[PDB]
């Protein structure tokens, strides 16, 4: 419809959210599931090495 300077304030909000999420949000997540997979895999690897 009608364009307005709302185009700019939301451009501030978007970059702020992106910076904060990129820094703090993502790195802590996805660690736990990877730890689960690595635990299963390394337990299997160690048990099979001892089996050999």
């Amino acid at each position: 419809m009608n364009l307005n300077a709302t185009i700019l304030g939301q451009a501030i909000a978007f970059v702020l959210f992106v910076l904060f999420a990129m820094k703090y949000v993502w790195p802590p997540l996805m660690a736990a599931i990877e730890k689960r997979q690595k635990e299963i895999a390394d337990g299997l690897a160690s048990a099979e090495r001892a089996h050999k």
Binding site: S46, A47, E48, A50, H51
Partner: protein, 52 residues
């Protein structure tokens, strides 16, 4: 699997270490038996031949 592997390794090591020692010791026993038998029977034969 780790527990079974360590237990089996210790069991087989102990068993082989015992059995090989037993075999070699009884081989020494057999050698000594043969030596004693020969040593006795030599003089037994000589004592027969002199009476002959």
């Amino acid at each position: 699997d780790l527990d079974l592997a360590k237990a089996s390794a210790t069991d087989q090591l102990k068993k082989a270490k015992a059995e090989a020692q037993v075999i070699i010791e009884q081989a020494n026993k057999r050698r000594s038996q043969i030596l004693d038998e020969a040593k006795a029977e030599a003089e037994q034969e000589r004592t027969k031949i002199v009476a002959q």
